[PDB]
C-alpha cells in the first residue's frame, strides 16, 4: 500500500505543496537511525516460531477451558488453525516495522477481522491475550532484555522502536476488542 516515506506525500497532496524542510527532517531522522531498525527486525524473524509456540501455549495454560470440548481449541484442526491465525497477525506486524508505517496491517489484515471472529465463534479475549504476549516477546528482543536468549549488537539505545511495536500490537488488539 504505502510506507512512511509515501505517507508524508499523501498528507501533502491535500496541501498541494512541495516537500521541503518543514516535513523532511523526520524522514532524515528515520534514515539516520535506519540501521537500528532492520537490526531489530532481524531479532524477530530469527526467533518468530518459538514466540507463537510459547504464545499459544501461554494462552492455553492460563485458560485451560480452551481445550475442553466447547472451547475453540478442542479439535486438532481447531488447534492447527490457531497457529496459522496467530502467525499471520505476527507476520503483518513485521511488515509495519520494516515499512515504518502501520498502513499495511490496518486494511489487508484487520479490515473485517472483528466481524469474522464473532461469525466463526472465535473467542475474542483469548486472542487478545495471545497477541499481548507477542507484544511482550517483541520488546524483550528489540532491546536485549529477554532472560534466556540474548544476542550481541552495536552498543546503543532502541527505545523508539520498542515503543513503536507496542503501538503496533494494540491497534491489532483494538481491532478485535
Amino acid at each position: 500500500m504505502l510506507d512512511a516515506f509515501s505517507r508524508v506525500v499523501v498528507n501533502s497532496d491535500a496541501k498541494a505543496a512541495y516537500v521541503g524542510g518543514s516535513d523532511l527532517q523526520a524522514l532524515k531522522s528515520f534514515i539516520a537511525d535506519g540501521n537500528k531498525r532492520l537490526d531489530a527486525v532481524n531479532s524477530i524473524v530469527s526467533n518468530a516460531s518459538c514466540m507463537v509456540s510459547d504464545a499459544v501455549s501461554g494462552m492455553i495454560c492460563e485458560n485451560p477451558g480452551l481445550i475442553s470440548p466447547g472451547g475453540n481449541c478442542y479439535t486438532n484442526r481447531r488447534m492447527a488453525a490457531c497457529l496459522r491465525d496467530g502467525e499471520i497477525i505476527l507476520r503483518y506486524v513485521s511488515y509495519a516495522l520494516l515499512a515504518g508505517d502501520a498502513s499495511v496491517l490496518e486494511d489487508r489484515c484487520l479490515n473485517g477481522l472483528k466481524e469474522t471472529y464473532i461469525a466463526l465463534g472465535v473467542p475474542t479475549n483469548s486472542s487478545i491475550r495471545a497477541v499481548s504476549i507477542m507484544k511482550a516477546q517483541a520488546v524483550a528482543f528489540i532491546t536485549n532484555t529477554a532472560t534466556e536468549r540474548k544476542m550481541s549488537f552495536a552498543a546503543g539505545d532502541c527505545t523508539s522502536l520498542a515503543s513503536e511495536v507496542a503501538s503496533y500490537f494494540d491497534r491489532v488488539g483494538a481491532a478485535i476488542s
Binding site: S49, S53, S57, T75, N76, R77, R78, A80, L83
Partner: protein, 164 residues
C-alpha cells in the same frame, strides 16, 4: 463424516439424481456388519480406562528417554497430558466404530495433527508405539468375536499408516 452412507449420497447428490437401488445394496452391507462392529465399540466403552493406562506404559518402555529434561515427559503435568492425548484417540476410535466409517478420525483427531506435533517437538514414533501395543495383545477369540477382532483392529492400524 466419511461414512458409507455419506459417500453414496454425496455421489447421488452430485449427479443430480434420486437414490438409486445401487446404493441400497451398500446399506444392506451395513446391517450385516453393524452387529459385528457395535460390540467392538460396546466392549470399548466398558474397558477404556483400563486399556488407556496399559497402553502408555509401553510408550515409556519402548522409549524411556522422554523423562529427560527438554523432552515431552520431564514433569508430571504433561505425562498426565500424554494419557489425555492418547485417550482422545481411543475415544475417536470408539466414535468411528459406531458410525461405521472413518469419519470422526480423519477429521477431528488426524487432520492438523502433523503440523502441531513437530511444532511442539512431539514425535509420532511414540504415538504409534502406544496403540501398536494395544492392537497386538488382544486375542481374537478371548475378548470378542472373530469379526470384531478383524474390523476394530483394522481401525487401529489406520492411524499408524496415516501418521507414518
Amino acid at each position: 463424516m466419511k461414512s458409507v452412507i455419506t459417500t453414496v449420497v454425496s455421489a447421488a447428490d452430485a449427479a443430480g439424481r434420486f437414490p438409486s437401488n445401487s446404493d441400497l445394496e451398500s446399506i444392506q452391507g451395513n446391517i450385516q456388519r453393524s452387529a459385528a462392529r457395535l460390540e467392538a465399540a460396546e466392549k470399548l466403552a466398558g474397558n477404556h480406562e483400563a486399556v488407556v493406562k496399559e497402553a502408555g506404559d509401553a510408550c515409556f518402555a519402548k522409549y524411556a528417554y522422554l523423562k529427560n529434561p527438554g523432552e515431552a515427559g520431564e514433569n508430571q503435568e504433561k505425562i498426565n497430558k500424554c494419557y489425555r492425548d492418547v485417550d482422545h484417540y481411543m475415544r475417536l476410535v470408539n466414535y468411528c466404530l459406531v458410525v461405521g466409517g472413518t469419519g470422526p478420525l480423519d477429521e477431528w483427531g488426524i487432520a492438523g495433527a502433523r503440523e502441531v506435533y513437530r511444532t511442539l517437538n512431539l514425535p509420532t514414533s511414540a504415538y504409534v508405539a502406544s496403540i501398536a501395543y494395544t492392537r497386538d495383545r488382544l486375542c481374537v477369540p478371548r475378548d470378542m468375536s472373530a469379526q470384531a477382532g478383524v474390523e476394530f483392529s483394522a481401525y487401529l492400524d489406520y492411524l499408524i499408516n496415516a501418521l507414518s
